Amino acid sequence: EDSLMEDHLELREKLSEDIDMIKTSLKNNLVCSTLNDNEILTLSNYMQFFVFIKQGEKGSYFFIINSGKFDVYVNDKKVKTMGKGSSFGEAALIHNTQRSATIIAETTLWGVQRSTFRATLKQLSNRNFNENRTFIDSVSVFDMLTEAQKNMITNACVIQNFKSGETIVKQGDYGDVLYILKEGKATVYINDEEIRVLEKGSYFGERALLYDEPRSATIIAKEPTACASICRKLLNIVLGNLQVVLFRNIMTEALQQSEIFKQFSGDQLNDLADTAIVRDYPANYNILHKDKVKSVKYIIVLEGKVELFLDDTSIGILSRGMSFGDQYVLNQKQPFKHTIKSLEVCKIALITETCLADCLGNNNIDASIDYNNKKSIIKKMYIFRYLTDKQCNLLIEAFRTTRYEEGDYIIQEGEVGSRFYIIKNGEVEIVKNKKRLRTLGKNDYFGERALLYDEPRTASVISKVNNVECWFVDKSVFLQIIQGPMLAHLEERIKMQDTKVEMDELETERIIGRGTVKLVHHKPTKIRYALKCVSKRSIINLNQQNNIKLEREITAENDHPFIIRLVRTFKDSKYFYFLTELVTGGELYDAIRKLGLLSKSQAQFYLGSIILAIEYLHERNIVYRDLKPENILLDKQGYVKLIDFGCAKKVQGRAYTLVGTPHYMAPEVILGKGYGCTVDIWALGICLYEFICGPLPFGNDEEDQLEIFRDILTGQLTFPDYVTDTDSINLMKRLLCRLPQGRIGCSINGFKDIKDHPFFSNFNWDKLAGRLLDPPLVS
Ligand SMILES: O=C(c1nccs1)N1CC[C@@H](Nc2nccc(-n3cc(C4CC4)nc3-c3ccccc3)n2)C1
Structure with a gap:
């Protein structure tokens, strides 16, 4: 296919004229009509030459006709002549294409293959993103952005190129664009006076992302200069508002470092951040003073610095992202004993009693801690995760406490259970047919199958120590809260995914799709499954060895109600197998x-x-x-x-x-x-x-x-x-x-x-x- 084409190649040094005409063709092309004059040039220099073209076979080459005329016979009979400037095999640049139709020559082609084309775009793109990302890490305004947020605004970067002597920004203009120099050199002018010279890695326009003020300098390229630029307009679409996101990130980071606010949900910490009172204070200013503090219980420093005192004794200096008031958040009726005095102009987030009750969903902090640390646990469990917020809230308040002492059988193998347990405090041994399977501790859970099925327990659960506390809910309460369809779903799902299945226990009923998908019955249990059979030989022959490994990995870890659930995989001499639930709707x-x-x-x-x-x-x-x-x-x-x-x-x-x-x-x-x-x-x-x-x-x-x-x-x-x-x-x-x-x-x-x-x-x-x-x- 392309083997023939390589015969026709000749090494021809492209003159200034040739780096011009190729630029035209690609600029007027489906895939290339939005590439910088930098990328079009890089692509242009990868173009091989061909002396002398296609048929109806598989083709990877895109051609830009240079010299002669080229007849294009569409259905084995002449369709149209084409000459100097024309192109063809556009489709080749996208995907392995069944050719448009044969193209004999009448009386020079520029050429490039798909592999070389996609690879050049890839290397250019990856290189440009990674450079822009490293540069964003050097711009201090973006410091409090998350990794995810930094990657998002990296995509927002637009490359701009500047001829020697070309203005980048003019003093007095109202730009909303920050520029980072990638290559070259600009002069900074203020009131027409030469101040200094920017170089690779220099940047300006921080203020232009935050305020709507005029440029404070005129900055002119001294040599050919390439910049990364972020516009406030695009930044606002991607981030919403830079300053808001920075202060929110500062506050949520601080709440995530606190031993009190640690154990609260991501939603609750975002409410606190978004609801916190934000105030400016002057320098050397008493912000909080002993008895004279009312509803304020917690402060986070957003800007500047404050000093914490207890009477006369300095405890420390709080700078950006540092926080104080754990003991006041825990004991909101106890008097405020501490003093906080600014060391400089500062900006502080104040969290009050009202802010705590509104965001943490209760007047009583210890009730809120208890509620959330029960919620965290069931919210990570499939059977509770997709219950409504009303159903979830009912289940959490249904949990009661019971206590156990060293050696107590909490569950006994063989008995009919009615209870789901969560460990408040202590350690338990799980024992199946006299063999210790594992030890569970604080915040681990057991017994959930009793909620879905009336069956013998499969293991004992034995208290390892004294003073063991578990939360428990009886299934009667779960069965009241849940409704018919969800319960049918869970009863169907859990039974079929936990059944131990061997290939010898399966018989085939019919073919579903065609390697082949079979509808199979598990003989011992009478449960129906789907079984996808992929040919071992077909995988080796399509170099799809790494790809099937990655398909099993993804298909395996999927545990969502609206995505197919894998039971297990099999392998023999001829096949890899996927056993999944049978979907019947x-x-x-x-x-x-x-x-x-x-x-x-x-x-x-x-x-x-x-x-x-x-x-x-x-x-x-x-x-x-x-x-x-x-x-x-x-x-x-x-x-x-x-x-x-x-x-x-x-x-x-x-x-x-x-x-x-x-x-x-x-x-x-x-x-x-x-x-x-x-x-x-x-x-x-x-x-x-x-x-x-x-x-x-x-x-x-x-x-x-x-x-x-x-x-x-x-x-x-x-x-x-x-x-x-x-x-x-x-x-x-x-x-x-x-x-x-x-x-x-x-x-x-x-x-x-x-x-x-x-x-x-x-x-x-x-x-x-x-x-x-x-x-x-x-x-
Ligand atoms: O609605 C039915 C039926 N109604 C009554 C009895 S069977 N079916 C819809 C398709 C079949 N169910 C099913 N369930 C899960 C997966 C698959 N399945 C179907 C396909 C086709 C080939 C593309 N692929 C799968 C599959 C199976 C296992 C793993 C991955 C995909 N089929 C049977």
């Missing part, structure tokens, strides 16, 4: 077939379901990459399951490989300058459009993969005349924002912006995950 496509165009409530249900599944994967740094209705089943209750984890990757910085279904692939995948979890939120938009409008919004009626990609890249997004709902159109437009930086869901707040969109105003996210909503369709 058919395909999502069966549902939209029967239903037609979805109403707002049916669309809310299916998109919202998918959003919760995708949010779960992103939280564990997985990008799904193949989101489409085809890849979603329904269970017997009408709730969804994501099934196909072939395209899924753990995210190690930036991904670059082209994977997925062309109609659903995000522009940033196609353009090859790198992508992350964002691509799944683009696909979310393609899915919603299908749901409401009916057809796909891009390349709906196109056979040619290339014309699909063009429509995704440049096509006008329109709606049919029967789609008028402002909130539906707005959510779809924002999801199909081509630039991932300004796409909805893709900023600091993540999926919160999608969940809180007006499209979902009447939509109960708790009731969805809790299986309390009526689905669009059942069975």
Whole structure:
């Protein structure tokens, strides 16, 4: 294919003229029409020369015609002549393409292969991101940004290049842009006077991100100069407001270092930060003084420095992010004994009694600590995690205390249990058929199966020591709080995932998909499963050895109600096997077939379901990459399951490989300058459009993969005349924002912006995950 093409090569030193004409062709090209004159040049210099071209076979080469004329016979008969300036095999730069059609020559080509093309974009992109990220770490204003936030604003960087003698900023102008010099040298002028010279790693415009004031200097490139630039406009979309995020981060970091506020939820600490009174004080100023302090119980320093005293005795100096008042937060009726005096102009966060009660959900701090440390534990457990907040709150207040002494059988192997236990204090031994399995301690849990099943306990639980306290809830209370569908779900899920299964215990009933997916019965238990069989030989032959390892890893650790649950894997001489739950509600496509165009409530249900599944994967740094209705089943209750984890990757910085279904692939995948979890939120938009409008919004009626990609890249997004709902159109437009930086869901707040969109105003996210909503369709 390409082997033939290499014969035609010749080493031709590109003159000034040639680095011009190649620049034109690529600038007027689907994939290259948004690359800097720096990247177009780097690509331009990688172009091989060819003396002398294609047929109908697999091809990797993109050509820019130099010298002669080239006839393009489309169906084995002349279609059109092409001459100096023209290009062809555009598709080759995207993906391994079945060629457009044969192209003989009449009477020089510039050339490059896909592998070399994608690799150059990759190396350029990674190099540029890593440089910008290191530079952002040298800008002190961004110090209190989280790692995640720093990576987000790195994407916001725009490269700018400046000819010698070209103004970067003018004194008096109202710029909202910060510049970091990547290469070259600028002169700083103030009132037309030469002050100093900026160099590589220099930066200015910090104030321009925070205030709306005029430039204090004119800065002019002395030699050719490249800058990284952040605009306040883009920073605001990505972060919301820089100063607010910095002060919130300072406060939440401090609360996470406190031995009192440590043990509280991430939501509660964000409430405290967001609700805290923030005040400026002058220098050498008494802020808090002994008896004369009222409702203030805790302070965090945001700026400057204060000195803590107890009567006359200096205890220490608090600077940024340091805090005081644990004993006052614990004992809010005890008198304030300490003094706090500013050592300089400072900014302090004050947390009051009212702020503590409003955020920690109780007048009584020790009740709040007790509530949360019970909540933390069950919230990490599958069976409690997806209960509504009402159901959760009922379960937590149902917990009572009991005590045990060294050697006491808390549970006895063989007995019918009714109780779930959490360890308040002490250590217990778990013993199954006389063999110690493990020791459990403070905050560990046991016995949960008694909630779902009337069965013999499988192990004893024996108190290891005296003075052992457990919280307990009886199943009668759990069974009152829970409702039919969720209980059926848990009873079905836990039984089938914990059954020990051997290959000899399985028989096949029918083939489901075709390697092959079989419907299998476990003979001893009569439980049904799906079994995916992948050919060992087929995997070795497609160098997919590393990829199947990574599929098992991802499929294994998935534990979400709206994602397929793996039971275990098998292997023999010929196959790898996946044993999963059997999903029996058919395909999502069966549902939209029967239903037609979805109403707002049916669309809310299916998109919202998918959003919760995708949010779960992103939280564990997985990008799904193949989101489409085809890849979603329904269970017997009408709730969804994501099934196909072939395209899924753990995210190690930036991904670059082209994977997925062309109609659903995000522009940033196609353009090859790198992508992350964002691509799944683009696909979310393609899915919603299908749901409401009916057809796909891009390349709906196109056979040619290339014309699909063009429509995704440049096509006008329109709606049919029967789609008028402002909130539906707005959510779809924002999801199909081509630039991932300004796409909805893709900023600091993540999926919160999608969940809180007006499209979902009447939509109960708790009731969805809790299986309390009526689905669009059942069975
Ligand atoms: O609705 C039904 C049925 N109704 C009554 C009896 S069976 N089915 C829908 C598809 C089948 N259920 C199912 N459950 C889980 C996974 C799979 N499944 C299907 C596919 C097709 C090939 C793409 N792939 C899987 C699968 C199975 C195991 C691991 C990974 C994926 N199928 C049966």
